[PDB]
Design a protein around this ligand. Sequence first.
Ligand SMILES: C[C@@]1(C(=O)Nc2cncc3ccccc23)CCOc2ccc(Cl)cc21
Ligand SMILES: C[C@@]1(C(=O)Nc2cncc3ccccc23)CCOc2ccc(Cl)cc21
Lengths: 304, 304
Amino acid sequence: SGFRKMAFPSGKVEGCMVQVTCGTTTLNGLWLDDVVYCPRHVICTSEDMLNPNYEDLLIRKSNHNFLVQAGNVQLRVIGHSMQNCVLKLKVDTANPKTPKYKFVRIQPGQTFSVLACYNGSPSGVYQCAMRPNFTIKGSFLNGSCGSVGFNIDYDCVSFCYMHHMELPTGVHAGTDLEGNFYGPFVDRQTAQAAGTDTTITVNVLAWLYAAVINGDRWFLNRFTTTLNDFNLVAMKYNYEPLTQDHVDILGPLSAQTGIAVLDMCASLKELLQNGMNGRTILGSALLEDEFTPFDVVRQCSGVT
Amino acid sequence: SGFRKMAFPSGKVEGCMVQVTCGTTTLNGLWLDDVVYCPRHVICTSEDMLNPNYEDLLIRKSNHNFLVQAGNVQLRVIGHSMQNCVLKLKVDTANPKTPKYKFVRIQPGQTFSVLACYNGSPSGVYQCAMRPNFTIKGSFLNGSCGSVGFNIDYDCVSFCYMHHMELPTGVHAGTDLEGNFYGPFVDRQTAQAAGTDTTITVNVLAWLYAAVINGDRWFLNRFTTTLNDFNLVAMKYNYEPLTQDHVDILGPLSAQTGIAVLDMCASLKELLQNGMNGRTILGSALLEDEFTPFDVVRQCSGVT
Ligand SMILES: C[C@@]1(C(=O)Nc2cncc3ccccc23)CCOc2ccc(Cl)cc21
Ligand SMILES: C[C@@]1(C(=O)Nc2cncc3ccccc23)CCOc2ccc(Cl)cc21
């Protein structure tokens, strides 16, 4: 029992972190097989960030201008290429610690773990979600660029995020491992504002199921609702609309607890309308939306 | 910017997790050098837990009754001993992945990361604190026993907790790595109730400093207070008394923000008396107490 914001064990990803330096800029790289992936803005100075022409800046760089250090040993760079907003640096040595891996592009609402790194060294691990506005609410300082987000399925690491930028609002933007940004963000120091950060409804419901499983049941009411009636309330509270696909995904949690998905929707509707009244659910005074239904099942079943 | 409940990278500890089985009971063990540490209740059946005589039960066990598996390979047990509530199983092979380590007994209010494990395999990592009532609010299922709590200082892992038990209230109890329980808990399935779970005041103040550093400043007021006046309020709200030692420990955060510790105490006093009024601090609607002043500095400075 108990329910925590749990991250995946980070060891498999720690074995891939390297430091990449180009000129005077240093950030993190991800070493998988004989390729090091890193944000393309490793070639920029702080002044270049205001209006960078990456293709033009990259012409002035050769393989020997990219310094890659793994632990305390230098890797030899034998090739370089730009794919969207990431650089792929071919090295002469395959990472001996390369885990089984995939590159995946996640959908908004999906969660992942982040291994925050500085100078190719891991500082910490935390769990977050891709927000509906395609930002992440991370914890990143200068030099954290190139830190990655991932999920693990038994022994396969699915890398889904590489950190690139902090917006003026303190929220974070980045790319998948093919270098495509999540959302409309561009790798330039210009006015980029995030859209509405709505609440991931299907995740809130999963966390309410997690609360019932772990004994917190005060919020369960005598009501039910319909998808359309619930969604009228969800729109009013800046919650994402719930679809039948989300109801289907909550099926296992509904079966485990014996609480129909629409009855849980009616409990959530009352919590939105009445508030918490100073009470807590799973030690929180807000409705938590960074646990997917898959996360709740995984944590409540002990998947390793 | 951004502030997350961050755990230490778990790789160094994942390299130490093994499975220990005795008879029909299986739990986790921690393999460091040529010794495997695990809860002594690995020798008990579910029926033995009601009233166990560990010394008597251990007489019926020989080295070959303890099965230790690391990954998928079996370790040879060449000795066994009981130290307080843990068993130390001497194996014939030193763990090649043994990190630099220390065994430390933490004080209430101190935080650590937990690598939750099942069958010697890591499931996840999360951050928690030793509560003032010597319980931890973890996320542990049956078979998680022997999972460990730790802190990392550059390359040295200080192990501080080994999981043993879940109380009927859903909170957790365990030992240090010498087998001594934190608090008054005993490894027996009997009525053990936890004492008052008070709020770790010095941690709340550190997290308020973290909020100011990260831009959340609405709660700062025009007031100051004294240690004695603040403590009258803290006692009323089940907060731990703040001492001059705690004020000293908040010195670096006070210097970074320019906010005197007693002025932050006055802001916290007003938050306790007035509540949040539906507002949030660092995305929380409650005052967070599982970040120490050291954690706030570490996260806000990027220590690797
Ligand atoms: C490199 C830089 C940045 O956001 N980096 C950072 C990333 N994370 C946390 C940060 C905390 C504090 C300071 C910078 C942070 C700064 C200049 O403007 C830009 C513009 C675009 C891009 Cl793709 C990166 C950047
Ligand atoms: C072994 C056992 C236990 O608490 N273990 C567990 C530890 N963590 C999470 C649990 C979640 C669900 C089921 C059990 C959990 C059960 C019997 O009573 C006792 C009594 C004493 C001790 Cl030292 C251990 C135990």
